[PDB]
Structures are given as structure tokens and as C-alpha cells.
Amino acid sequence: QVSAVAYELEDYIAELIEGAPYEETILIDPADTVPAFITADQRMGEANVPTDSR
Amino acid sequence: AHIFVKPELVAEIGVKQLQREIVLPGLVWTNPLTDFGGSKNDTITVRVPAITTA
């Protein structure tokens, strides 16, 4: 019972994170994966999001 | 001509039959169950516990 509630809470959080209104999705190229994450950092930056606590 | 009575000498010089080295027994789960006598068909049934959903 406790395990079920714990997993339901983690799924609640995951639904929150996955269901957020993302206006666009960054496509990771499997052969060259790093540029996608540099793009993610860039999108965070141009939005003036603080660099700590990410 | 000359006749010499000689033995047939047998020697061991460390030439053996090349034969495999054993590694598999040490890596597999051996005897988590022992009481096969005393269970029908020599079969012990393992119970996998339950998980719920919240």
C-alpha cells in the first residue's frame, strides 16, 4: 500500500512535468546528441532563466 | 652382433590433455531452494509477492 502511494506520487509529479505547456520540443539527433542539449541551455538562457538550480 | 637386454622406459614430462577451465558454476544462483524432497513432483513453488496501485 505504501509503495503504491509512493509510485502514484511519482506519477503525479511525472504527469505534471510531462504535461506542461511546452510550446516546442527540441529534437535530439542520436548520432550528435550534444547540440540538442546546448540548444536546451540556449532556450533557457534567452528566456533569462537563472542558471542555478536546474 | 652384440645383444643388449633393455627395458622400455616410461616417463611423465607434464604433457597432459588440454581441457577446459570451469567458470560457470560460480556465477549462477545455486541452491536458493533445498527441500525438493517433501514437495510433490520434486517441485518447490516460489511465490512472487504482490504489488498494488493507488
Side-chain angles (χ1 to χ4, degrees), chain B residues 14-51:
Chain B
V15 160
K16 306 160 43 174
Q17 318 204 38
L18 311 168
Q19 184 177 2
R20 181 178 63 237
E21 61 86 20
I22 299 158
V23 295
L24 281 194
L27 320 173
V28 292
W29 201 8
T30 286
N31 277 314
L33 294 174
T34 50
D35 207 25
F36 293 102
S39 187
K40 293 187 286 185
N41 297 115
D42 314 328
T43 297
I44 298 187
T45 174
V46 173
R47 167 176 45 227
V48 193
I51 67 177

PDB file of all heavy atoms in Angstrom, chain B residues 14-51:
ATOM      1  N   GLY B  14      54.879 -33.883 -17.951  1.00  0.00           N
ATOM      2  CA  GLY B  14      53.952 -32.783 -17.824  1.00  0.00           C
ATOM      3  C   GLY B  14      53.113 -32.497 -19.044  1.00  0.00           C
ATOM      4  O   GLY B  14      52.468 -31.446 -19.098  1.00  0.00           O
ATOM      5  N   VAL B  15      53.110 -33.381 -20.032  1.00  0.00           N
ATOM      6  CA  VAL B  15      52.209 -33.264 -21.169  1.00  0.00           C
ATOM      7  C   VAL B  15      50.893 -33.916 -20.779  1.00  0.00           C
ATOM      8  O   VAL B  15      50.833 -35.124 -20.534  1.00  0.00           O
ATOM      9  CB  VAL B  15      52.810 -33.909 -22.428  1.00  0.00           C
ATOM     10  CG1 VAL B  15      51.733 -34.224 -23.442  1.00  0.00           C
ATOM     11  CG2 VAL B  15      53.841 -32.992 -23.036  1.00  0.00           C
ATOM     12  N   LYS B  16      49.844 -33.110 -20.697  1.00  0.00           N
ATOM     13  CA  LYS B  16      48.519 -33.556 -20.315  1.00  0.00           C
ATOM     14  C   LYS B  16      47.558 -33.327 -21.469  1.00  0.00           C
ATOM     15  O   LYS B  16      47.922 -32.780 -22.510  1.00  0.00           O
ATOM     16  CB  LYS B  16      48.031 -32.821 -19.066  1.00  0.00           C
ATOM     17  CG  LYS B  16      48.980 -32.896 -17.900  1.00  0.00           C
ATOM     18  CD  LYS B  16      48.705 -31.799 -16.895  1.00  0.00           C
ATOM     19  CE  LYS B  16      47.215 -31.634 -16.647  1.00  0.00           C
ATOM     20  NZ  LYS B  16      46.936 -30.662 -15.553  1.00  0.00           N
ATOM     21  N   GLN B  17      46.321 -33.764 -21.279  1.00  0.00           N
ATOM     22  CA  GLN B  17      45.276 -33.497 -22.251  1.00  0.00           C
ATOM     23  C   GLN B  17      44.690 -32.122 -21.974  1.00  0.00           C
ATOM     24  O   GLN B  17      44.152 -31.880 -20.891  1.00  0.00           O
ATOM     25  CB  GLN B  17      44.198 -34.570 -22.198  1.00  0.00           C
ATOM     26  CG  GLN B  17      44.746 -35.962 -22.065  1.00  0.00           C
ATOM     27  CD  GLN B  17      43.788 -37.003 -22.580  1.00  0.00           C
ATOM     28  OE1 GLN B  17      43.110 -36.794 -23.580  1.00  0.00           O
ATOM     29  NE2 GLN B  17      43.730 -38.137 -21.903  1.00  0.00           N
ATOM     30  N   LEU B  18      44.814 -31.222 -22.943  1.00  0.00           N
ATOM     31  CA  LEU B  18      44.296 -29.874 -22.778  1.00  0.00           C
ATOM     32  C   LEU B  18      42.795 -29.937 -22.558  1.00  0.00           C
ATOM     33  O   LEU B  18      42.077 -30.619 -23.294  1.00  0.00           O
ATOM     34  CB  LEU B  18      44.632 -29.028 -24.000  1.00  0.00           C
ATOM     35  CG  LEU B  18      46.091 -29.086 -24.440  1.00  0.00           C
ATOM     36  CD1 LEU B  18      46.246 -28.454 -25.794  1.00  0.00           C
ATOM     37  CD2 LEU B  18      46.988 -28.413 -23.435  1.00  0.00           C
ATOM     38  N   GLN B  19      42.322 -29.229 -21.542  1.00  0.00           N
ATOM     39  CA  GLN B  19      40.977 -29.442 -21.045  1.00  0.00           C
ATOM     40  C   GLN B  19      40.484 -28.147 -20.416  1.00  0.00           C
ATOM     41  O   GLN B  19      41.255 -27.408 -19.802  1.00  0.00           O
ATOM     42  CB  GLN B  19      40.999 -30.637 -20.079  1.00  0.00           C
ATOM     43  CG  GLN B  19      39.701 -31.114 -19.505  1.00  0.00           C
ATOM     44  CD  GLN B  19      39.921 -32.332 -18.635  1.00  0.00           C
ATOM     45  OE1 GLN B  19      41.053 -32.770 -18.450  1.00  0.00           O
ATOM     46  NE2 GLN B  19      38.842 -32.917 -18.136  1.00  0.00           N
ATOM     47  N   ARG B  20      39.193 -27.883 -20.577  1.00  0.00           N
ATOM     48  CA  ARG B  20      38.631 -26.557 -20.344  1.00  0.00           C
ATOM     49  C   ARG B  20      38.770 -26.132 -18.884  1.00  0.00           C
ATOM     50  O   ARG B  20      38.868 -26.960 -17.980  1.00  0.00           O
ATOM     51  CB  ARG B  20      37.155 -26.546 -20.750  1.00  0.00           C
ATOM     52  CG  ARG B  20      36.460 -25.224 -20.579  1.00  0.00           C
ATOM     53  CD  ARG B  20      35.018 -25.254 -21.044  1.00  0.00           C
ATOM     54  NE  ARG B  20      34.181 -26.173 -20.284  1.00  0.00           N
ATOM     55  CZ  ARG B  20      33.492 -27.172 -20.817  1.00  0.00           C
ATOM     56  NH1 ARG B  20      33.532 -27.426 -22.111  1.00  0.00           N
ATOM     57  NH2 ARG B  20      32.736 -27.929 -20.029  1.00  0.00           N
ATOM     58  N   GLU B  21      38.812 -24.819 -18.661  1.00  0.00           N
ATOM     59  CA  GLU B  21      38.739 -24.262 -17.315  1.00  0.00           C
ATOM     60  C   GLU B  21      37.309 -23.835 -17.005  1.00  0.00           C
ATOM     61  O   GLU B  21      36.613 -23.287 -17.865  1.00  0.00           O
ATOM     62  CB  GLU B  21      39.726 -23.101 -17.149  1.00  0.00           C
ATOM     63  CG  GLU B  21      39.516 -21.911 -18.057  1.00  0.00           C
ATOM     64  CD  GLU B  21      38.532 -20.929 -17.506  1.00  0.00           C
ATOM     65  OE1 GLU B  21      38.302 -20.969 -16.280  1.00  0.00           O
ATOM     66  OE2 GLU B  21      37.982 -20.141 -18.307  1.00  0.00           O
ATOM     67  N   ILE B  22      36.877 -24.099 -15.778  1.00  0.00           N
ATOM     68  CA  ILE B  22      35.475 -24.018 -15.390  1.00  0.00           C
ATOM     69  C   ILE B  22      35.210 -22.681 -14.699  1.00  0.00           C
ATOM     70  O   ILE B  22      35.881 -22.338 -13.721  1.00  0.00           O
ATOM     71  CB  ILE B  22      35.105 -25.195 -14.474  1.00  0.00           C
ATOM     72  CG1 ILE B  22      35.318 -26.525 -15.194  1.00  0.00           C
ATOM     73  CG2 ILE B  22      33.694 -25.082 -14.008  1.00  0.00           C
ATOM     74  CD1 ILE B  22      35.481 -27.687 -14.275  1.00  0.00           C
ATOM     75  N   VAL B  23      34.240 -21.921 -15.213  1.00  0.00           N
ATOM     76  CA  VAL B  23      33.844 -20.649 -14.609  1.00  0.00           C
ATOM     77  C   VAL B  23      32.354 -20.539 -14.340  1.00  0.00           C
ATOM     78  O   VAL B  23      31.953 -19.767 -13.450  1.00  0.00           O
ATOM     79  CB  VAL B  23      34.306 -19.454 -15.477  1.00  0.00           C
ATOM     80  CG1 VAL B  23      35.798 -19.394 -15.531  1.00  0.00           C
ATOM     81  CG2 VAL B  23      33.730 -19.528 -16.886  1.00  0.00           C
ATOM     82  N   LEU B  24      31.507 -21.267 -15.059  1.00  0.00           N
ATOM     83  CA  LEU B  24      30.063 -21.063 -14.970  1.00  0.00           C
ATOM     84  C   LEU B  24      29.465 -21.350 -13.597  1.00  0.00           C
ATOM     85  O   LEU B  24      28.602 -20.568 -13.164  1.00  0.00           O
ATOM     86  CB  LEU B  24      29.375 -21.898 -16.055  1.00  0.00           C
ATOM     87  CG  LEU B  24      29.415 -21.298 -17.454  1.00  0.00           C
ATOM     88  CD1 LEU B  24      28.441 -22.006 -18.347  1.00  0.00           C
ATOM     89  CD2 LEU B  24      29.086 -19.832 -17.365  1.00  0.00           C
ATOM     90  N   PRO B  25      29.827 -22.424 -12.884  1.00  0.00           N
ATOM     91  CA  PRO B  25      29.179 -22.685 -11.590  1.00  0.00           C
ATOM     92  C   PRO B  25      29.248 -21.535 -10.607  1.00  0.00           C
ATOM     93  O   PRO B  25      28.301 -21.341  -9.838  1.00  0.00           O
ATOM     94  CB  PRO B  25      29.948 -23.902 -11.069  1.00  0.00           C
ATOM     95  CG  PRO B  25      30.352 -24.599 -12.262  1.00  0.00           C
ATOM     96  CD  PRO B  25      30.685 -23.556 -13.269  1.00  0.00           C
ATOM     97  N   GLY B  26      30.332 -20.766 -10.600  1.00  0.00           N
ATOM     98  CA  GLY B  26      30.471 -19.716  -9.613  1.00  0.00           C
ATOM     99  C   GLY B  26      29.625 -18.492  -9.867  1.00  0.00           C
ATOM    100  O   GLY B  26      29.507 -17.652  -8.970  1.00  0.00           O
ATOM    101  N   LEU B  27      29.027 -18.372 -11.048  1.00  0.00           N
ATOM    102  CA  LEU B  27      28.300 -17.164 -11.403  1.00  0.00           C
ATOM    103  C   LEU B  27      26.790 -17.318 -11.362  1.00  0.00           C
ATOM    104  O   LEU B  27      26.089 -16.306 -11.426  1.00  0.00           O
ATOM    105  CB  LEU B  27      28.702 -16.690 -12.800  1.00  0.00           C
ATOM    106  CG  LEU B  27      30.178 -16.791 -13.167  1.00  0.00           C
ATOM    107  CD1 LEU B  27      30.360 -16.451 -14.613  1.00  0.00           C
ATOM    108  CD2 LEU B  27      31.010 -15.879 -12.302  1.00  0.00           C
ATOM    109  N   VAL B  28      26.271 -18.531 -11.248  1.00  0.00           N
ATOM    110  CA  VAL B  28      24.831 -18.764 -11.261  1.00  0.00           C
ATOM    111  C   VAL B  28      24.325 -18.974  -9.844  1.00  0.00           C
ATOM    112  O   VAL B  28      25.031 -19.510  -8.983  1.00  0.00           O
ATOM    113  CB  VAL B  28      24.463 -19.962 -12.155  1.00  0.00           C
ATOM    114  CG1 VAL B  28      24.723 -19.629 -13.597  1.00  0.00           C
ATOM    115  CG2 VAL B  28      25.268 -21.171 -11.751  1.00  0.00           C
ATOM    116  N   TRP B  29      23.089 -18.546  -9.609  1.00  0.00           N
ATOM    117  CA  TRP B  29      22.410 -18.696  -8.332  1.00  0.00           C
ATOM    118  C   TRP B  29      22.175 -20.161  -8.005  1.00  0.00           C
ATOM    119  O   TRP B  29      21.281 -20.792  -8.572  1.00  0.00           O
ATOM    120  CB  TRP B  29      21.085 -17.948  -8.374  1.00  0.00           C
ATOM    121  CG  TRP B  29      20.528 -17.595  -7.062  1.00  0.00           C
ATOM    122  CD1 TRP B  29      21.131 -17.718  -5.855  1.00  0.00           C
ATOM    123  CD2 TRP B  29      19.226 -17.069  -6.814  1.00  0.00           C
ATOM    124  NE1 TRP B  29      20.288 -17.294  -4.864  1.00  0.00           N
ATOM    125  CE2 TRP B  29      19.110 -16.888  -5.429  1.00  0.00           C
ATOM    126  CE3 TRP B  29      18.145 -16.731  -7.630  1.00  0.00           C
ATOM    127  CZ2 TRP B  29      17.962 -16.385  -4.843  1.00  0.00           C
ATOM    128  CZ3 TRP B  29      17.012 -16.230  -7.047  1.00  0.00           C
ATOM    129  CH2 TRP B  29      16.925 -16.061  -5.670  1.00  0.00           C
ATOM    130  N   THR B  30      22.955 -20.706  -7.079  1.00  0.00           N
ATOM    131  CA  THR B  30      22.923 -22.124  -6.755  1.00  0.00           C
ATOM    132  C   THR B  30      22.246 -22.334  -5.411  1.00  0.00           C
ATOM    133  O   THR B  30      22.617 -21.701  -4.418  1.00  0.00           O
ATOM    134  CB  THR B  30      24.333 -22.709  -6.721  1.00  0.00           C
ATOM    135  OG1 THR B  30      24.834 -22.836  -8.056  1.00  0.00           O
ATOM    136  CG2 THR B  30      24.320 -24.068  -6.072  1.00  0.00           C
ATOM    137  N   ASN B  31      21.266 -23.229  -5.388  1.00  0.00           N
ATOM    138  CA  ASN B  31      20.531 -23.647  -4.201  1.00  0.00           C
ATOM    139  C   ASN B  31      19.932 -22.510  -3.387  1.00  0.00           C
ATOM    140  O   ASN B  31      20.262 -22.370  -2.204  1.00  0.00           O
ATOM    141  CB  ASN B  31      21.426 -24.482  -3.291  1.00  0.00           C
ATOM    142  CG  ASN B  31      21.490 -25.925  -3.712  1.00  0.00           C
ATOM    143  OD1 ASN B  31      20.471 -26.538  -4.007  1.00  0.00           O
ATOM    144  ND2 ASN B  31      22.693 -26.476  -3.744  1.00  0.00           N
ATOM    145  N   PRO B  32      19.047 -21.685  -3.954  1.00  0.00           N
ATOM    146  CA  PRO B  32      18.112 -20.945  -3.104  1.00  0.00           C
ATOM    147  C   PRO B  32      17.014 -21.825  -2.533  1.00  0.00           C
ATOM    148  O   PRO B  32      16.334 -21.402  -1.589  1.00  0.00           O
ATOM    149  CB  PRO B  32      17.545 -19.886  -4.051  1.00  0.00           C
ATOM    150  CG  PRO B  32      17.703 -20.459  -5.393  1.00  0.00           C
ATOM    151  CD  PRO B  32      18.942 -21.273  -5.364  1.00  0.00           C
ATOM    152  N   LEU B  33      16.837 -23.032  -3.068  1.00  0.00           N
ATOM    153  CA  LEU B  33      15.832 -23.988  -2.628  1.00  0.00           C
ATOM    154  C   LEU B  33      16.500 -25.332  -2.388  1.00  0.00           C
ATOM    155  O   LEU B  33      17.349 -25.755  -3.178  1.00  0.00           O
ATOM    156  CB  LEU B  33      14.727 -24.139  -3.673  1.00  0.00           C
ATOM    157  CG  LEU B  33      13.860 -22.914  -3.920  1.00  0.00           C
ATOM    158  CD1 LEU B  33      12.912 -23.161  -5.066  1.00  0.00           C
ATOM    159  CD2 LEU B  33      13.091 -22.596  -2.661  1.00  0.00           C
ATOM    160  N   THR B  34      16.114 -26.010  -1.308  1.00  0.00           N
ATOM    161  CA  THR B  34      16.783 -27.254  -0.946  1.00  0.00           C
ATOM    162  C   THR B  34      15.824 -28.412  -0.690  1.00  0.00           C
ATOM    163  O   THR B  34      16.176 -29.570  -0.933  1.00  0.00           O
ATOM    164  CB  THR B  34      17.657 -27.042   0.292  1.00  0.00           C
ATOM    165  OG1 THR B  34      16.892 -26.393   1.314  1.00  0.00           O
ATOM    166  CG2 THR B  34      18.873 -26.196  -0.045  1.00  0.00           C
ATOM    167  N   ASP B  35      14.621 -28.127  -0.203  1.00  0.00           N
ATOM    168  CA  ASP B  35      13.706 -29.175   0.251  1.00  0.00           C
ATOM    169  C   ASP B  35      12.858 -29.713  -0.904  1.00  0.00           C
ATOM    170  O   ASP B  35      11.632 -29.667  -0.885  1.00  0.00           O
ATOM    171  CB  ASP B  35      12.825 -28.650   1.376  1.00  0.00           C
ATOM    172  CG  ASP B  35      12.349 -29.747   2.301  1.00  0.00           C
ATOM    173  OD1 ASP B  35      13.028 -30.789   2.389  1.00  0.00           O
ATOM    174  OD2 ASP B  35      11.296 -29.565   2.948  1.00  0.00           O
ATOM    175  N   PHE B  36      13.539 -30.238  -1.922  1.00  0.00           N
ATOM    176  CA  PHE B  36      12.816 -30.814  -3.050  1.00  0.00           C
ATOM    177  C   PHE B  36      12.201 -32.152  -2.681  1.00  0.00           C
ATOM    178  O   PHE B  36      11.116 -32.497  -3.160  1.00  0.00           O
ATOM    179  CB  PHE B  36      13.741 -30.940  -4.249  1.00  0.00           C
ATOM    180  CG  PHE B  36      14.166 -29.624  -4.793  1.00  0.00           C
ATOM    181  CD1 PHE B  36      15.413 -29.119  -4.515  1.00  0.00           C
ATOM    182  CD2 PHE B  36      13.302 -28.878  -5.557  1.00  0.00           C
ATOM    183  CE1 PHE B  36      15.792 -27.909  -5.004  1.00  0.00           C
ATOM    184  CE2 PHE B  36      13.677 -27.665  -6.047  1.00  0.00           C
ATOM    185  CZ  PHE B  36      14.923 -27.177  -5.773  1.00  0.00           C
ATOM    186  N   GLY B  37      12.886 -32.928  -1.848  1.00  0.00           N
ATOM    187  CA  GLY B  37      12.214 -33.999  -1.139  1.00  0.00           C
ATOM    188  C   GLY B  37      11.240 -33.401  -0.150  1.00  0.00           C
ATOM    189  O   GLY B  37      11.595 -32.519   0.639  1.00  0.00           O
ATOM    190  N   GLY B  38       9.997 -33.854  -0.199  1.00  0.00           N
ATOM    191  CA  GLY B  38       8.956 -33.235   0.582  1.00  0.00           C
ATOM    192  C   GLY B  38       8.118 -32.227  -0.162  1.00  0.00           C
ATOM    193  O   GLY B  38       7.364 -31.489   0.477  1.00  0.00           O
ATOM    194  N   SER B  39       8.246 -32.152  -1.481  1.00  0.00           N
ATOM    195  CA  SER B  39       7.344 -31.377  -2.313  1.00  0.00           C
ATOM    196  C   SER B  39       6.973 -32.211  -3.529  1.00  0.00           C
ATOM    197  O   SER B  39       7.828 -32.875  -4.118  1.00  0.00           O
ATOM    198  CB  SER B  39       7.978 -30.058  -2.734  1.00  0.00           C
ATOM    199  OG  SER B  39       7.041 -29.243  -3.410  1.00  0.00           O
ATOM    200  N   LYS B  40       5.693 -32.184  -3.902  1.00  0.00           N
ATOM    201  CA  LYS B  40       5.225 -33.063  -4.965  1.00  0.00           C
ATOM    202  C   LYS B  40       5.935 -32.779  -6.277  1.00  0.00           C
ATOM    203  O   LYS B  40       6.155 -31.622  -6.642  1.00  0.00           O
ATOM    204  CB  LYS B  40       3.716 -32.953  -5.178  1.00  0.00           C
ATOM    205  CG  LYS B  40       2.880 -33.461  -4.041  1.00  0.00           C
ATOM    206  CD  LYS B  40       1.404 -33.482  -4.409  1.00  0.00           C
ATOM    207  CE  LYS B  40       0.781 -32.111  -4.448  1.00  0.00           C
ATOM    208  NZ  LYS B  40      -0.681 -32.202  -4.704  1.00  0.00           N
ATOM    209  N   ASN B  41       6.277 -33.854  -6.989  1.00  0.00           N
ATOM    210  CA  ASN B  41       6.925 -33.792  -8.296  1.00  0.00           C
ATOM    211  C   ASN B  41       8.311 -33.167  -8.201  1.00  0.00           C
ATOM    212  O   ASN B  41       8.822 -32.628  -9.182  1.00  0.00           O
ATOM    213  CB  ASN B  41       6.064 -33.033  -9.307  1.00  0.00           C
ATOM    214  CG  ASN B  41       4.740 -33.720  -9.577  1.00  0.00           C
ATOM    215  OD1 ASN B  41       3.680 -33.187  -9.253  1.00  0.00           O
ATOM    216  ND2 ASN B  41       4.794 -34.903 -10.177  1.00  0.00           N
ATOM    217  N   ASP B  42       8.919 -33.236  -7.015  1.00  0.00           N
ATOM    218  CA  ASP B  42      10.212 -32.608  -6.743  1.00  0.00           C
ATOM    219  C   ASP B  42      10.195 -31.126  -7.080  1.00  0.00           C
ATOM    220  O   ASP B  42      11.227 -30.539  -7.400  1.00  0.00           O
ATOM    221  CB  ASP B  42      11.345 -33.304  -7.497  1.00  0.00           C
ATOM    222  CG  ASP B  42      11.282 -34.803  -7.385  1.00  0.00           C
ATOM    223  OD1 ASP B  42      10.825 -35.300  -6.337  1.00  0.00           O
ATOM    224  OD2 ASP B  42      11.683 -35.485  -8.351  1.00  0.00           O
ATOM    225  N   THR B  43       9.020 -30.514  -7.008  1.00  0.00           N
ATOM    226  CA  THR B  43       8.814 -29.139  -7.428  1.00  0.00           C
ATOM    227  C   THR B  43       8.516 -28.289  -6.207  1.00  0.00           C
ATOM    228  O   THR B  43       7.550 -28.551  -5.484  1.00  0.00           O
ATOM    229  CB  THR B  43       7.665 -29.039  -8.432  1.00  0.00           C
ATOM    230  OG1 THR B  43       7.991 -29.776  -9.614  1.00  0.00           O
ATOM    231  CG2 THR B  43       7.410 -27.594  -8.805  1.00  0.00           C
ATOM    232  N   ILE B  44       9.338 -27.271  -5.987  1.00  0.00           N
ATOM    233  CA  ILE B  44       9.067 -26.238  -4.998  1.00  0.00           C
ATOM    234  C   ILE B  44       8.568 -25.020  -5.752  1.00  0.00           C
ATOM    235  O   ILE B  44       9.209 -24.570  -6.706  1.00  0.00           O
ATOM    236  CB  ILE B  44      10.310 -25.898  -4.164  1.00  0.00           C
ATOM    237  CG1 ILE B  44      10.775 -27.115  -3.375  1.00  0.00           C
ATOM    238  CG2 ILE B  44      10.011 -24.769  -3.215  1.00  0.00           C
ATOM    239  CD1 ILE B  44      11.880 -26.807  -2.407  1.00  0.00           C
ATOM    240  N   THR B  45       7.419 -24.504  -5.344  1.00  0.00           N
ATOM    241  CA  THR B  45       6.831 -23.342  -5.993  1.00  0.00           C
ATOM    242  C   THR B  45       7.284 -22.087  -5.261  1.00  0.00           C
ATOM    243  O   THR B  45       7.104 -21.956  -4.049  1.00  0.00           O
ATOM    244  CB  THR B  45       5.311 -23.474  -6.053  1.00  0.00           C
ATOM    245  OG1 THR B  45       4.729 -22.270  -6.559  1.00  0.00           O
ATOM    246  CG2 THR B  45       4.734 -23.815  -4.715  1.00  0.00           C
ATOM    247  N   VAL B  46       7.923 -21.190  -5.998  1.00  0.00           N
ATOM    248  CA  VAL B  46       8.346 -19.901  -5.478  1.00  0.00           C
ATOM    249  C   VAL B  46       7.199 -18.914  -5.622  1.00  0.00           C
ATOM    250  O   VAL B  46       6.586 -18.809  -6.692  1.00  0.00           O
ATOM    251  CB  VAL B  46       9.594 -19.401  -6.216  1.00  0.00           C
ATOM    252  CG1 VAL B  46       9.917 -17.988  -5.796  1.00  0.00           C
ATOM    253  CG2 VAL B  46      10.763 -20.314  -5.951  1.00  0.00           C
ATOM    254  N   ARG B  47       6.911 -18.189  -4.547  1.00  0.00           N
ATOM    255  CA  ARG B  47       5.890 -17.155  -4.546  1.00  0.00           C
ATOM    256  C   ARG B  47       6.535 -15.805  -4.823  1.00  0.00           C
ATOM    257  O   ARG B  47       7.436 -15.380  -4.096  1.00  0.00           O
ATOM    258  CB  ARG B  47       5.155 -17.129  -3.211  1.00  0.00           C
ATOM    259  CG  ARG B  47       4.307 -15.906  -3.004  1.00  0.00           C
ATOM    260  CD  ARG B  47       3.549 -15.996  -1.712  1.00  0.00           C
ATOM    261  NE  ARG B  47       4.398 -16.453  -0.624  1.00  0.00           N
ATOM    262  CZ  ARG B  47       4.057 -17.404   0.232  1.00  0.00           C
ATOM    263  NH1 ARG B  47       2.885 -18.009   0.160  1.00  0.00           N
ATOM    264  NH2 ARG B  47       4.915 -17.755   1.184  1.00  0.00           N
ATOM    265  N   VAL B  48       6.084 -15.144  -5.881  1.00  0.00           N
ATOM    266  CA  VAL B  48       6.454 -13.771  -6.192  1.00  0.00           C
ATOM    267  C   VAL B  48       5.388 -12.873  -5.583  1.00  0.00           C
ATOM    268  O   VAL B  48       4.200 -13.014  -5.910  1.00  0.00           O
ATOM    269  CB  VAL B  48       6.577 -13.557  -7.704  1.00  0.00           C
ATOM    270  CG1 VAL B  48       7.254 -12.248  -7.998  1.00  0.00           C
ATOM    271  CG2 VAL B  48       7.336 -14.700  -8.323  1.00  0.00           C
ATOM    272  N   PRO B  49       5.756 -11.955  -4.690  1.00  0.00           N
ATOM    273  CA  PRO B  49       4.753 -11.163  -3.970  1.00  0.00           C
ATOM    274  C   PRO B  49       3.934 -10.244  -4.862  1.00  0.00           C
ATOM    275  O   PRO B  49       4.142 -10.180  -6.076  1.00  0.00           O
ATOM    276  CB  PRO B  49       5.599 -10.362  -2.978  1.00  0.00           C
ATOM    277  CG  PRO B  49       6.858 -11.129  -2.850  1.00  0.00           C
ATOM    278  CD  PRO B  49       7.113 -11.699  -4.187  1.00  0.00           C
ATOM    279  N   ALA B  50       2.991  -9.530  -4.259  1.00  0.00           N
ATOM    280  CA  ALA B  50       2.037  -8.710  -4.984  1.00  0.00           C
ATOM    281  C   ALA B  50       2.410  -7.239  -4.896  1.00  0.00           C
ATOM    282  O   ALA B  50       3.104  -6.809  -3.974  1.00  0.00           O
ATOM    283  CB  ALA B  50       0.625  -8.905  -4.435  1.00  0.00           C
ATOM    284  N   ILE B  51       1.951  -6.478  -5.881  1.00  0.00           N
ATOM    285  CA  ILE B  51       2.074  -5.028  -5.894  1.00  0.00           C
ATOM    286  C   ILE B  51       0.703  -4.449  -6.227  1.00  0.00           C
ATOM    287  O   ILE B  51      -0.030  -5.004  -7.051  1.00  0.00           O
ATOM    288  CB  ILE B  51       3.143  -4.546  -6.900  1.00  0.00           C
ATOM    289  CG1 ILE B  51       2.722  -4.832  -8.335  1.00  0.00           C
ATOM    290  CG2 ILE B  51       4.478  -5.210  -6.636  1.00  0.00           C
ATOM    291  CD1 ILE B  51       3.692  -4.325  -9.351  1.00  0.00           C
TER     292      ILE B  51
END
